[PDB]
Structures are given as structure tokens and as C-alpha cells.
Design a protein around this ligand. Structure first.
Ligand code: 8DG
Ligand code: NA
Length: 156
């Protein structure tokens, strides 16, 4: 089995809208996603999620709720991505656009699934229902899922 690298993903989910960030530069740009990145040495997963939210979106929150975990495998890549998914409903500043990321609010009847990673269509609806989940997705490139598993869980 492949080794896996730890990542976080943060969704700011308010009662009527969700905050997403559009990748501005590099390869893979043009998709909306939660805020996140690699966990760094010595930090807890939750603290890495708070750090990435601040660095990417400019938002500082005191805490996050863990809602899921999703493992991504890419054909031709040696490591899995072990992505710990967090939520919060409570913010106290404004999102900030950078050269790398543009944050944007979407109403919850306008979730931009067509411009999100294909796996999001499967697990995002569970997140919206206050459910917790574990998932795994194998991708060929950016657009094609070859295999996936998804399960609702009581505890993550
Ligand atoms: N399938 C899927 N892949 C995702 C999602 N979100 C997400 O970042 N990815 C993948 C695509 C990118 O290749 C990779 C982004 O991680 P990253 O390399 O930007 O993390 P980072 O910011 O710590 O790295 P770096 O820019 O500092 O080098 O993760 C998602 O929601 N679904
Ligand atoms: Na990132």
C-alpha cells in the first residue's frame, strides 16, 4: 500500500452560503475548492487546518469541526493524499483574495459543482446534511474517477 501525506480541507458553511476558493495559478487552476494544504511538522491536524484557512483565505477562526476524511489516489503518483475535512459556521473577518486564490461565497442552491473536483459531488451533500463521512477516490488525471468508496460514519 502507498504511503500517504496529510492534508486539510476547510469549508466555511453558513446557514445559506458556503465559502470556496478558486485556484488562480499553476496547473489544476480554475476549480473551486475548500481551503487547505499540507499539514506541517509538529502541528495537529486541526491547527494545520486553521493555519491553511488563514494563509489561503485570510480568515482566522479559533476552532474547527472535523466532519470527514477523504483519501485521494492519482494514477501515476506514488503517494496517497489523506485529506481531513473540517467545517465551521463562525467567522469574524472578511475573506481576502491573493495571487494564488480568490475566495467567493455561493448560495447553497448554487453550489458550483461543475467547477469543483468531481469527488465533491459525492461527499459535499453529506456535509450539508450534518453527516460525517469517510471516502476514497482514485483519479486518472483531473476529471476521471476509476474507483471510489464513500460511507457515512457516526464518528470520524
Ligand atoms: N480530488 C480532489 N483533489 C483535491 C481537492 N482539493 C485539493 O487541494 N486537491 C488536490 C489537488 C492538488 O493537486 C492538491 C493541492 O495541494 P497543495 O499542493 O496545493 O497543498 P499545499 O498548498 O500545502 O502545497 P504547496 O502549494 O505549498 O506546494 O490537492 C479536492 O477537493 N478533491
Ligand atoms: Na493549497
Amino acid at each position: 500500500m502507498k504511503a500517504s501525506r496529510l492534508y486539510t480541507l476547510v469549508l466555511v458553511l453558513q446557514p445559506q452560503r458556503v465559502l470556496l476558493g478558486m485556484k488562480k495559478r499553476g496547473f489544476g487552476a480554475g476549480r473551486w475548492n475548500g481551503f487547505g494544504g499540507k499539514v506541517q511538522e509538529g502541528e495537529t491536524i486541526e491547527d494545520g487546518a486553521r493555519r491553511e484557512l488563514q494563509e489561503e483565505s485570510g480568515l482566522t477562526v479559533d476552532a474547527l469541526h472535523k466532519v470527514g476524511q477523504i483519501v485521494f489516489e492519482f494514477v501515476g503518483e506514488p503517494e496517497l493524499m489523506d485529506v481531513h475535512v473540517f467545517c465551521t459556521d463562525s467567522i469574524q473577518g472578511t475573506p481576502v483574495e491573493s495571487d494564488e486564490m480568490r475566495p467567493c461565497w455561493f448560495q447553497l442552491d448554487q453550489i458550483p459543482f461543475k467547477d469543483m473536483w468531481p469527488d465533491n459531488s459525492y461527499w459535499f451533500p453529506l456535509l450539508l446534511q450534518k453527516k460525517k463521512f469517510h471516502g476514497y477516490f482514485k483519479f486518472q488525471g483531473q476529471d476521471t474517477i476509476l474507483d471510489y468508496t464513500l460511507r457515512e460514519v457516526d464518528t470520524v
